[PDB]
Amino acid sequence: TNLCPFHEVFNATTFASVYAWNRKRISNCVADYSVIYNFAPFFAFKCYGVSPTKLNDLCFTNVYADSFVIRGNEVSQIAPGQTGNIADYNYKLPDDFTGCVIAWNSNKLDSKPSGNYNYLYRLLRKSKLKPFERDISTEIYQAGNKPCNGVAGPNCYSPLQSYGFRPTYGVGHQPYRVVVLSFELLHAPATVCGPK
Amino acid sequence: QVQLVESGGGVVQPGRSLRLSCAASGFTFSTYSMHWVRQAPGKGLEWVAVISYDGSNKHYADSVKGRFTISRDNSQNTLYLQLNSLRPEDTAVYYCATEGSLTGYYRYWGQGTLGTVSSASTKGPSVFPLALGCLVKDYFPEPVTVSWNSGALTSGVHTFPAVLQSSGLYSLSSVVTYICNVNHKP
Amino acid sequence: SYVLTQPPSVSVAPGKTARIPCGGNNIGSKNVHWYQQKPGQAPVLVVYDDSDRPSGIPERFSGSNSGNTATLTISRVEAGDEADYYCQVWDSSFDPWVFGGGTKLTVLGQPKAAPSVTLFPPSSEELQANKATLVCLISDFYPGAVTVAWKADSSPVKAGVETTTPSKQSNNKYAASSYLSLTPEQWKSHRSYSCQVTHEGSTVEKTVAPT
Ligand SMILES: *[C@@H]1O[C@H](CO)[C@@H](O[C@@H]2O[C@H](CO)[C@@H](O)[C@H](O)[C@H]2NC(C)=O)[C@H](O)[C@H]1NC(C)=O
Predict the structure, then answer these.
(1) Whose CA is closest to C34, among C112, C82, C103, C91?
(2) CB C151: neighbour CB atoms within 10 A?
(3) How many CB atoms lie under 10 A from the CB of residue A145?
(4) Distance between CA C68 and CA C62 in Å, rounded?
(5) In whole angstroms, what is the distance from residue A63 CA to residue A99 CA?
(6) Disulphide bridges in this chain (chain A)?
(7) In a mutagenesis test of the C interface, which of B33, B50, B130, B158 is the best target, namely the one with the most C β-carbons within 10 Å?
(8) What is the bridge-based pairing of β-strands A120-122 and A160-162?
């Protein structure tokens, strides 16, 4: 039994966009949750199926660690039952989620004075995403009256729009990295227990 | 059992279209997301396209954006891929893969189909002199890769690797322990 | 996009442990999947989430994900495990499924072999059309690394020189082809040309003659 890649996920030099969020499956390692608080000045640490201090006691089989960046005023949207542009078109948690949502400010790392348009979010979609569904399609949205034929002509808009983080001023619009830890029952021989 | 059979392609001129298909069985075809991975002769694996479980989400690579279109037919569990607006650099062995989970691992594979983009056609089965058996230099001068009509004795005839020879023609040589004129397929 | 780095080729002794790495920037934050592709068939999954194996894979296959490089630990590599391996990761880019450059894991079965060169003067029946024709063929080599070495009496030749990629044999001495297109009007009239091959530092003094 070795250590978990928790320290290699929260301190990534490049974070995934909300429409291309990674899912690092964690198995066969001892979960040392003491390293989480060292690099996560959490703005919201609401756990919905576990306790933050009892993580070193319970044990799970497989742990999934999502990673995505969203707007500052959209941190509350990453929660079971929430709505919004992110909670409905980019990342939606189920009503029976069992884990914790970790989010911290990253204005000193994920922001540039010339505009960091490398992070994009989806604006519109014909239907909401299923729980834990990844949306990779970049096809031009159609207005319905006429097809766009792959070009963004009249009444044809691109589905991906950048955030454009501005480090000058403004609260609620700063870049915030979000990591979501998912725990499944999975009644099978466990592999990732606490450091006991 | 899990079976994936890709329909063969063939020799096609540039700017034409190649119609491929991938029949799948043994697993739930309507649940897993099907992908496409091509492999050029002597090159590594390269991703082509991804089709959603219902056909809504579609994505392509930058080198094949615009001209290629991916589609699936869950009514008969056949994965399709329209290779419209072919290019010389599209000659690759297309493999029919299946995505396992959100982490992005493939568990099911086929056998691959051969799609060759050639610029010429056949010129006739010109046999060669200097033939036990025959020791000719050319056999079935296909412009690119095909080679048959081994007129030598099948007891110990050798099969030498095919050469590209982009000059315009290709020659197949075979040796085995008078002249040679046997030729049946044009 | 992401750039997975693989070694060009890794050689391992039979029964030992072979380790094929796969480096990358911050590769620990994502899962590395491996595939086994045998020459003439499709790749087969071996280890997907850096730790687990599907049904039908022996326990000798294993992997790990730590630091800035992956690791595929394959122990007790028999002679039947000669295949190519590829990595796969999901990146924060426009999402192309980045595959590695490929690594050919070869098992040292035979120490060395001597190639055989076959060459005979072409008859005059092909001279009616005056087509470019070379007859020397080289085969019977185990290492599989041969290069075309047409020597113009210990000197290069014009119109460029190309080497045909070798093909896999039936687990024995391989074969190759060393013929291309060049003017046959000056074939063996004098020292202008002579066909030889450099099999990793070894040549064949053929001393060919016409007729
Ligand atoms: C997490 O990442 C940050 C930034 O990549 C690391 O911060 C560096 O820390 C070293 C030593 O503490 C300094 O010399 C560098 O100047 C820091 N870089 C920046 C940009 O501040 C931090 O060390 C990492 N945490 C680890 C490795 O545990």
Answers:
(1) C103
(2) 16
(3) 6
(4) 18
(5) 9
(6) 4-29, 47-100, 59-193, 148-156
(7) B130
(8) antiparallel
Min Cα–Cα distance to chain A from B57, Å: 5
Kindly list the distances between the CA atom of residue C186 and the CA atoms of B46, B86, C162, C204, in Å, as whole numbers in the listed order. Answer: 45, 41, 19, 22
d(CA B49, CA B94): 11
Are A182 and A64 in contact, with CB atoms under 8 Å apart?
yes
Q: Is B53 helix (H, G, I), strand (E, B) or coil?
A: coil
Q: What is the DSSP string of chain A?
A: --B-THHHHTT-SSPPPSTT-EEEEE-SSB--GGGTTTS---S---BSSS-SSSTTT-EES-EEEEEEEE-GGGGGGSSTT--SHHHHHT----TT--EEEEEEE-TTTS--TT-BTT-EEE---SSPPPTT------PPB--SSS--TTS--TT-B-SEEE--B-SSS-SS-S-EEEEEEEE----S---EE---
The owner of tokens 């790749």 is C43
Contact C184, C132 (CB under 8 A): yes
Within 8 A by CB and 6+ apart from C15, the residues are C76, C77, C78
User: Using a CB-CB distance cutoff of 8 angstroms, which residues of chain B are in contact with residue A139?
Assistant: 58
Q: In the structure encoding, which two tokens stand for residue A3, read together?
A: 């250590």
CATH tag for C110-211 (out of 3.40.50.1000, 3.30.420.40, 3.30.1330.40, 2.60.40.10): 2.60.40.10
> Within an 8 Å CB–CB cutoff, is residue C208 touching chain B?
no
Nearest to C92 among A8, A20, A25 (CB): A20
Solved with: cryo-EM
What is the token pair recorded at C67? Answer: 């630091």
Instruction: Domain ranges for chain B, please list them.
Output: 3-117, 120-186
Report chain B's terminal Cα–Cα distance, integer Å: 40
Please choose, from the candidates A196, A191, A194, the residue with its C-alpha nearest in 3D space to the C-alpha of residue A56: A194
Structure tokens at A172: 């609620």
> Which residues face B176 on adjacent strands?
none
User: Both tokens of residue B38?
Assistant: 């091509």
CA gap A96, C184 in Å, rounded: 79
A2, A32, A1: which is closest to A10 by C-alpha? A32
Separation of alpha carbons A12 and C91, rounded Å: 12
The number of beta carbons lying within 10 Å of the beta carbon of residue A131 is: 12
Q: Which domains does chain A have, with CATH numbers?
A: 1-196 (3.30.70.1840)
Pick the residue of C98, C177, C197, C208 with the most B CBs within 10 A to test the interface with B by mutation. Answer: C177
Ordered by start, the domain boundaries in chain C are 9-107, 110-211
CATH class of the structural domain C9-107: mainly beta
Residue B104 region by backbone torsions, left for phi larger than 0, else alpha for psi between -120 and 50, else beta: left
> Does A150 contact B59 at a Cβ distance shorter than 8 Å?
no
Q: What is the widest separation between alpha-carbon atoms in chain C? A: 68
Third-level CATH fold of B3-117: Immunoglobulin-like (2.60.40)
